[PDB]
Amino acid sequence: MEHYISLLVKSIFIENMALSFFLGMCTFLAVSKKVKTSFGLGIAVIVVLTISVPVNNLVYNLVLKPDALVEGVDLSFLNFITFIGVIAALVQILEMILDRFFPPLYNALGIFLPLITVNCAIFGGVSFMVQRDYSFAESVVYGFGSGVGWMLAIVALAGIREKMKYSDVPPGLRGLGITFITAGLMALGFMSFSGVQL
Amino acid sequence: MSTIIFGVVMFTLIILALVLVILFAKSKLVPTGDITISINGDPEKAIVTQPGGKLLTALAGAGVFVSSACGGGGSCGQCRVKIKSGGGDILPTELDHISKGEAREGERLACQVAVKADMDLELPEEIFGVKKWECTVISNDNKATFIKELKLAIPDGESVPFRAGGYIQIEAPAHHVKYADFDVPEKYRGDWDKFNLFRYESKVDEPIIRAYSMANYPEEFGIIMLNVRIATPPPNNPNVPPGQMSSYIWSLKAGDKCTISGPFGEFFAKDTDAEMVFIGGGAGMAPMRSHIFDQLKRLKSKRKMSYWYGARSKREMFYVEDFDGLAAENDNFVWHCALSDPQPEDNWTGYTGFIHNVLYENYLKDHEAPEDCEYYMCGPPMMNAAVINMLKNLGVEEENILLDDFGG
Amino acid sequence: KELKKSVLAPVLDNNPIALQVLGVCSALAVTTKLETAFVMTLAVMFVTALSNFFVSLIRNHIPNSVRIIVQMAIIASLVIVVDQILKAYLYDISKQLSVFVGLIITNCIVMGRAEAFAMKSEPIPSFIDGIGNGLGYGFVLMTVGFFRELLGSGKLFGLEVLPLISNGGWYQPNGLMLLAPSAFFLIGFMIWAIRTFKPEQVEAKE
Amino acid sequence: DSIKKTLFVVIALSLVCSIIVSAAAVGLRDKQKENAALDKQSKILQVAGIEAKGSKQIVELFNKSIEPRLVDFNTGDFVEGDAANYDQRKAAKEASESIKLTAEQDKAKIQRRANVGVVYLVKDGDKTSKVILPVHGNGLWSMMYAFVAVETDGNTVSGLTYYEQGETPGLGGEVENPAWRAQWVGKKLFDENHKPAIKIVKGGAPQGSEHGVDGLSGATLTSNGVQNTFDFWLGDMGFGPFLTKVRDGGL
Amino acid sequence: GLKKFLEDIEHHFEPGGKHEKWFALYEAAATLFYTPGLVTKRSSHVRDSVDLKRIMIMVWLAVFPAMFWGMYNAGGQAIAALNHLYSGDQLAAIVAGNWHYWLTEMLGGTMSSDAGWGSKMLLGATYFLPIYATVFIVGGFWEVLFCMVRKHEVNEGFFVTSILFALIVPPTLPLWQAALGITFGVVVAKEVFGGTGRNFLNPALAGRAFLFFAYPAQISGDLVWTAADGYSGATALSQWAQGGAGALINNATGQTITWMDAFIGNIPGSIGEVSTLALMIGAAFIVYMGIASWRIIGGVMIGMILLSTLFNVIGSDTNAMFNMPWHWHLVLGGFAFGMFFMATDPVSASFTNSGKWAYGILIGVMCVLIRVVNPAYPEGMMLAILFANLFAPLFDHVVVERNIKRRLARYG
Amino acid sequence: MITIKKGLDLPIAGTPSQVISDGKAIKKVALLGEEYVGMRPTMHVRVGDEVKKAQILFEDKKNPGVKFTSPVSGKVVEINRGAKRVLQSVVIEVAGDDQVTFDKFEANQLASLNRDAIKTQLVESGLWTAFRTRPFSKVPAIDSTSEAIFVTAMDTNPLAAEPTVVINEQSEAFVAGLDVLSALTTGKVYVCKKGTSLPRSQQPNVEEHVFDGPHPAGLAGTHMHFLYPVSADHVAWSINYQDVIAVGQLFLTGELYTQRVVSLAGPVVNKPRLVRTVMGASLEQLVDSEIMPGEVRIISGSVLSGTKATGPHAYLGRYHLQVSVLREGRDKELFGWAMPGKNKFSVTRSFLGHLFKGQVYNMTTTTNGSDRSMVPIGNYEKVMPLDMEPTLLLRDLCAGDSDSAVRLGALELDEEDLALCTFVCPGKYEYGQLLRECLDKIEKEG
Ligand SMILES: Cc1cc2nc3c(=O)[nH]c(=O)nc-3n(C[C@H](O)[C@H](O)[C@H](O)COP(=O)(O)OP(=O)(O)OC[C@H]3O[C@@H](n4cnc5c(N)ncnc54)[C@H](O)[C@@H]3O)c2cc1C
Ligand SMILES: CCCCCCCC[C@H]1O[C@H]1C/C=C/C=C\[C@H](O)CC(=O)NC1=C[C@](C)(CC)OC1=O
Ligand SMILES: Cc1cc2nc3c(=O)[nH]c(=O)nc-3n(C[C@H](O)[C@H](O)[C@H](O)COP(=O)(O)O)c2cc1C
Ligand code: FES
C-alpha cells in the first residue's frame, strides 16, 4: 500500500502533468474561464487517462514489447499509432455515452470532447508509462494520479482567473497574454517540489 | 524481411479491431429510431423525422413558413419559437437574441435546437396562416432620383392579411441586368453623373431573398404597393456591384411576373389615447403612409397625429397630394417637411437642415409633455441616430420610441 | 493570386499560438536551443503540409463514423517516418527532443488544420495552408528560442556570442531562461507586442 | 455509408500506411544502431586521450586502440562474453543478473549493482597502457555517470569525464568543466595501506597534495555525490578486487 | 510658504499647462505634504479616518526594529569573521581593499575586534542602505511609468514592497541583481495586473523567487550570508540538516548557537530576518491595530506545530531534520519574518474568515515540508507562501459555495 | 430575542433631547421625484394650479395605478426638472385647508375589512407609497400581495428619534394601523422593536420580535434576513411606525394624516430635539436660526444614508424621519495622515481616539484620504452582521458582475444596508450606487 501511496502522491504533486511537465496547455489556457467548467473538463480527463494508460500497458506488454510476440521480432515502431488509436477510440466511446443515452452532461463541455483526443497530457502519460515500465496496478495508479493532478492545476487556474474579475489588465494583455503570465507564475510557485525524490 | 510482414499485419489488425469496437459501441449507444415533431397543433399536424440535425430543417422540409429574415446569416434573430417539452439546454449564442426573462419560458431559436429527441412546439400565434402568392406587376413608377414605387396584383380576388406597417418577403432568381435597361425619366436621371451609373451592371448565379415594407394600408384592397430604392455603390469605393435584387426589381414593368410571401411585422401602432408623431426621411414614407391612412380611415378615432419628413432637395418629395387631402379632411393630422440641400430650381421657402433639428426647435422645444407622445421612426442612418438622441435628451423613454430600420 | 496571402497570413494575422491557442506544449519545451527549435519547426511544417494534402485528397470517401481514426492513422504514420529519419540522421537532436517528436501527433495545429481546412478544400490549397501555419508556428518558436538561448547560455546555434565568466568572459548566464516559466513570460510579451501593432486582435472586455 | 465500404476504406488505408511505415522503420535500424554506438565510442576515445573527429576516424581508432572486456566484481577477474554489446545499465536492474545492495553497502545510492561489468583497455600494439572504468552515483538532482582512466599501476588517474549528469548548469554542472576535470590527472586512488584515498575537499585542495581535489564552489550536495561515487566504486563492492589484481599483476 | 507654493504652481500641471504630463508626480507630492481637502458627495456623508497612507506607514514603521537590529548584526558578524580570519598587516590590507571597510574606518569607526555597536551598525548600514536605495529608485521608476502611461494615481504599497524586498536578501547582493529582482517583482507580478489591490501574487517574494532561480549562486551557499572577504561558513538550518543540534556552532567565534541566540538574532542570514524578538515586537502593534490577520498567523503556527510534531513522532535515523522541534523551527530561517509580515498581505490572502485559517495552515505545512523532506533547499518559507497564493481563491470558492447552498436553504 | 454582535454605533456629537416640541412654521412642501425607485411621472398638475390635500399630483408610468398625492392644500408654484428633464420636485405653497375625504370605520371593524377595500382606500389616498418591496425597494404593484409585512418600531440610525416617545402619543392610531395591516397581509405582520413595551394588537397573526445590538440592528433588511429571508419568489413589504400611525388615522377618521415628528440634531445644531413638522416640509425653512454660523450641509435623513438637501432637493424625504446638519470639512492639514489623532474616529485601532472610551466627535464631511483600490484590511466583516461574504460581494459589485452578486446575496440588500461598508472603506468606495446599478440590471433583464 505504501508504494502505491508514494506513486500517487508523486504523480499528483511532484510530477504534476500540467505545472511540472507542461502538457495539455491549449485546453488548460483556453477553458480556464469558469471553475465548474474546468471541473467537468478535469473529471473527463481523469476518466480518459485512467482508462487509457492500463489498456496501453496491456497492449504494449502483450504485442509491442521486443520478443513479446515472436522471438527476434520487435514491433516497437507501432507505439505511437497504437497509443493514439486506443485513446481516440476510448474518447469517441465516452463522448457517445455523454452526449447521449446515459447523462446529458455533454452540452456545457461542447467542442472540447473532440479536442480531448489531442490533449498532449494523455499521450505523454502513456509514453512515460512505457518508458518507466510499470506494472498493471502501477499503471492504473499513475494514470489516476496524473489525471487528478491535471484537474487540480486547471481548477486552481480557473479560480485565479475568476479572482481576476477585479483586475485592470492593459488592453493588449487582456486575454491570452495575461493568462500566459499567470500560468508562468503558477509554475514558479509549483517549483517548490523540484528537489523532492519520492 | 519478416519484421515487415509482421508490422503490416499487426497495423492492419489493430486498426480494424479499434474500428470494429467503435461501430459495435455505436449500435448500442445511438438510438437509430424515429420520432414525431409535436406541434401546438392537431394530432395529424406532427412531422415524422429521424433524429439528427437542426430543428428548423424539418419545418422547412414540411413546407411550414418558419420564421426567418435577412436570408439568415446567423444574425437576424427572428428564428425564435416556444418549446414546452424537450427543448434541452440553451446554446450561449442564443443569449444575444433571447433575454433571460424570455428564455425561462422555454423560447428557443430554431437554428440551434437540434432534433435529437421528441419535442413539443407551441408555434407562436398560428404561423400556419402565412401564405405565398404568384402575382403580376400593375405598375413600376419612378418618384425620386433613387426611389420607385412597385404596384402588385393579388390573384383569385384575394387580399393579403396584414396590418399597417407590415412587410413581405421577395425572392429573385439567377439574373443579369444592366443600368442601360432602366426606364428612369430624365428629370431624375440627370443626377446619376455623380458616379456615371450608366456604366454599371449586376448579375447573380443563384437565387436570393429579401424583404420590403408595404406602402398601402389595410383598406387599400386588392393590391400591395411598395417603395423601392435603387441600391447604388457606396461613394468611397463606387466600383463595387450595385444591389443584386434592387436592380432586378428596378427593371420590372407593368405586366411582369412577381411573387410575394411572408406577411410580417412588429411595427404595429399602440392602441392608446396619447398623441402620435411620425418621423422619417427618404424611402421611409411607405410605413408612414400606411399608418396615417389606416388610423384616419379605418380606426377613425379622434387622436392627434403629426408627420415630419426630411429630404435632400424638393425633387425628392412625393405623396403630397395624398397627405394634403388627408389633412384637408382631418384637422387631427398635419404634415411638415424640410430640405437638407434646397436647390436653385426648388424655390424652397420652408425649413432647412436636418429634420430632427427642425422638429426639436419648432415643435418639441415648446411641447407641454414630450414624453407622453409616441414616436415612430424610419429613415437614413443619421436620422436613425440623431432623432433617437434628441428624443432621449427630452426624457422620452424607450417604450415610446419605435424604430424600424432597413435591416441594418 | 492567393498563394502569398495564404502562406503569409498565419505569420501575424492568424498566428497558430498567439491568436488560436494551438501548438503550445512544444513551444514551451523545445525552445531552449535554436537547433532544436529549428528542427521542430521543419518537422511540423512537413507533417502538417503532407497530412493536409492527403486528408484533402481523400475527403470525399472518408467514412464519417471513423474520420478521426483515419486522420490519426495518416498523421501517426507521417510522424513515425519522421522519427525514424531523425534517429537515423540527426541522432543528437533526436536524443534532445525526446518525447516531443512523438507528441507531434497530438500537436493541436496538425489536427486543427486537418479538420478545419483539409476536409473543406482542395489538395494544393491544403498543402499551402499547412506550409503557412508551420511558418507562423516557426516564427513564434524561433523568436522565443533566440531570447532563451542567448540570455541563458550566451550562445546562438551553439556559437558563443556572449563570453561566460566560467570560460573567462564577462557575462553571467540567467538560470531562469533555462526553465519552463520563462517561455510563458516571453510568449505573453510577444502577444502584447503583436496586439499593440495589430489592434483588431484585442479581445472585447467582459 | 455502408459498413462494407467503411471497412474496405479502413483496410486499404491501413495497408498503404503500414507498408511504408514498416519499410522505413526496418531499413534504418542498422544506421540508428551505428549512431548509438558511435556516440559512446567518441566519449571513450576522448577520455582515453585520443583525438578523433568524424565517424570514420572514430570507428577506426576505437577498433585499433580500445578493447572492451567483462569483469566479475566479486572476484575481480575477466569473464567470457560479447563485451562490445553488453548493456550494464540493463543487467543491473534485472533480478537474475544483479544484486540488491544493503543500506550500509550502498554508499553511492544506486540500490543495485550488476553481477559483471565492462571495462575498456587502451592498447599500444599488444601492450596495455590504461584501463577505463565506468562509474556512477547519485548527485543532488540526477544520477551522474563518468569514465575514469587509470594507469597500469592501478593507483594513478590519467583523466576523468562526466558524460551524463543533470545538475544545475552553474552550480552542480561544473563536473563537466574542463578546468575542474584537469585536476584529476596524476592523483592517486589509494594510499600506502591500499585503501580508498580520493578526497573531494571543501574550500579547495592544498596545492601539491596527491589525493585532494577542489570541491565544487557553492555545490556540496553534488561534491558529496562524487565522493560517495568514488568511495563505493573503489571498495569491495566495486572495482576493488579488480584493481588489486591489476596492481599485483595483469593486463 | 510650502502651502501657498504648492497651490500657486498647480497651473503648470493643469490641462493645457507647461507640464500637463507630470500631473501625476505633482499630485503625489502635493497630497504627500498636505491632505486632499476633499468632501463626500453622494452618501455616507461621514467617513472613517483610516486610509491607505496610514495603513502603509504603520507597516513600514513596524519593521524598523528588525531593520536596525539586522544592520547591527550584519556589521557584528562581518567584523567577527574578519578578525577570525586575518590579523595585523593582512587585516589592514584587506580593509584598504574594500570600500565598505575603509569607509567605516573613515567615518570614525574601527574594524578591530573591540569595535562597538556604533561601528557595527555603521558597517551594517554601508551594506543595507545602497541595496534599499537601488531597489526603491528602480522599482519607483516602473511604478511611475505605468501609472503615468495609464493615467492612474500613483499610490502606496510599493513603499512597503521596496523595504520588504530589501530586508529579505543577503547583505552581499549585487546591486544590478537587486535592480533586476525589483523590476521583475514590480512589473511582472503586480503592474501588468493593474497595480495595488489587483494582483494575486506577493510582489516582494516574486522578485526574490526570480533571483533564487535565476542566480542561485549569489543567494545561497556558504559565501553569501556573512559579509566578510574570504569567509565561508554555514548557517543554522544547513548545520542542522548536516548534523543535528550538535552541529550548531559559530565558526567565527567557536561558540555554540543556543536557542536564546537564535531568538535574539545573534546568527547570520538575511538582513532583517534574524531577530524573532524584534519581529514579534513589530508584529504585535500591527496585529493589535487590526491591519494584520491573527487568523492567518494562528493558522501558520498551527500547521507548523502539527507537521513538526508528526515528524518528531515518526522519526528518522538518517535525516537529522526529523528531530527539530517546533520551538526550533520557529526561531531559525525566515519563518518568523514571513509569517508576521509576508503571509499577511491582504491582497494575496483569502478574503474569507474561514479561508484564512486554511491559508495559514497550508503555508505552515508547506514551509515545514520543504525544510524537512526537500534536500535541495534548506528553507521554504517564500516557496510555501507563493504556493499558497495559488490556492487561496479555491478556499474562498469552497466557503462561498457552502454559503450559497445555505442561502438557497432560506437560512442566509 | 435576536442579538446583533457586529455593527457600529457612530459616536457623532449633538444627540437630540427626546422631547417633542413645535417646529418652525412651514410655508412650502414638495414631493421629490428621484427618491422613488423606478418611477416615471405623469404630471396631473401644472404651475399655477390649486390643489386640495390628498389630491393627485402625478402617476407612475412604470407602476400603473399608483397615485402620488399632495400633502397639503395650496398652490403649485414650481415643477423642477434636471438633466434629461428628469423630475426633481413638485413644490406646493401652503394656503387654505381644503381636503379630499374617504370612508371611516370603527376601531373594532378594521381587523375584518376586505383586502381589496383596504387597497382601494390606500391607493386613492396616496398612502400606498409608504410600502416598499424587498427585493428592489419599490412601491408594491396594486394587484399584488405578500405574506410578510414588516413594521419598523425601532430606529438605530445616528441621532435618530426614539420611536417609543412618538408612539405613546398615538397608541390608538398605531394599534388601528396594525389591525389594518393584519387584514391586508396574506401571512403575518412582524413588529420589530427593542426591549421596551409598545401598544399591542390582539390579532393572532401580528407578532412582536425584539432585536438587540448596535446598528444595523434596526434595519428592515436585517429583520427580513433574520425572520423571513427574501428572494425573487419571496417578496416582503416594509413600512415604518409613523406611516402605520398615518394608516390608522386614515381608516379611523377618513382623512390623510400628514404630520411628522422628526429629529433635528447634529454637531452644528444649537438645541438638538424632536420637532413637529409636516410631510415634505422645506428643510431650509425648518432649520432657520437653528444652526451655528459657517458653511454646513443639511441632510434629509441620516448621515449614513440620506440626501444632501440643497436647491430643488431641499425638502424632507418621504421615507426620512430626521434631519442631520454638520459642517463642511474642506481644511488641509500638514501631514494630517501621519498625526497621532486623539480626535479622529476609526473602526481600526490606528488612532489614539479609541483609547478614550466614551469620547464624542465633531465629525464633518471630510473624505479622510483619496480614492484607491480595495485592500481588504477586514473592516467590512466587523460591521456586516448578515450571513454573507462582504469582501467578495463588494468586489462583485465593483466589477459589475450582477449574475454572481445575485448569488452572493444582492437581492436581500438596499442602499442603506451597505452604508457602514461605505463608511469603513479605506479605498473610499461608495457601494450604494454600485448596488443600485446592479439591481437596475437585474430588474431590467427579468
Ligand atoms: C423589414 C425590412 C423592410 C425593408 N423595407 C425596405 C423598403 O421598403 N424599401 C427598400 O428599398 N428596402 C427595404 N429594405 C431593405 C432591403 O430589404 C435590403 O436590405 C436591400 O436594401 C435590398 O438591396 P439588394 O438586396 O438588391 O442588394 P444587396 O446585394 O443586399 O446590397 C449589397 C450592397 O453592398 C455593397 N457592397 C458589396 N460589396 C461591397 C464591398 N466590398 N464594399 C462596399 N460595398 C459593397 C453593394 O454595392 C450594395 O450596395 C427592408 C429591409 C427589411 C429587413
Ligand atoms: C517615467 C518618469 C521618470 C521616473 C520617475 C523618477 C524616479 C522615481 C523613483 O524614485 C522613486 C519614486 C517613486 C515612487 C513610487 C511609488 C511609491 O509607492 C509612492 C510612495 O511611496 N508614496 C508614499 C509614501 C508615503 C510617504 C507614506 C505612505 O506617502 C506616500 O504618498
Ligand atoms: C521571508 C524569507 C523567505 C525565505 N525563503 C527561502 C526559501 O524559500 N529558500 C531558501 O533556501 N532560503 C529562504 N530564505 C533565506 C533563509 O531563511 C536563510 O536566510 C538562508 O537560507 C541562510 O540561512 P540558513 O541556511 O540557516 O537557513 C528566506 C528568507 C526570508 C527572510
Ligand atoms: S500542443 Fe495543444 S495540448 Fe499540447
Ligand code: FES
Ligand atoms: S439564422 Fe436566424 S437566428 Fe439563426
Ligand SMILES: [Ca+2]
Ligand atoms: Ca551497475
